[PDB]
């Protein structure tokens, strides 16, 4: 396994992603994935 | 053309209903980014 | 607490909730920008 901190996430509404940029190496490493964005 | 992506402000995770919610920095704060997730114990 | 995991490809969020050994874990893309 790699575990590493999540130290900032966004989403995004155009692209229906989320980014999680991670602590990790020289810093230029996310985890990305989609998702749904509405209004509750 | 390209609109930033937003912090996410909360993110609250459902056992219930198998998803996450992240609750973004934009409008009148009601509106997130859902989506499925497994939920389980560790061991 | 929020992980990310680029050898299984996982994003994991520790739950409070209860014993606080229960996660939520979902797929994820991991790369390098
Ligand atoms: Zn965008
Ligand atoms: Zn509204
Ligand atoms: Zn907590
Ligand atoms: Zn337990």
Do not use: E, I, S
Not at 9 to 30: E, I, M, Q, S
């Amino acid at each position: 396994m790699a575990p590493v901190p999540v130290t900032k996430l966004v989403c995004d509404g155009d692209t229906y992603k989320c980014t999680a940029y991670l602590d990790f190496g020289d810093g230029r490493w996310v985890a990305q994935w989609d998702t749904n964005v509405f209004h509750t």
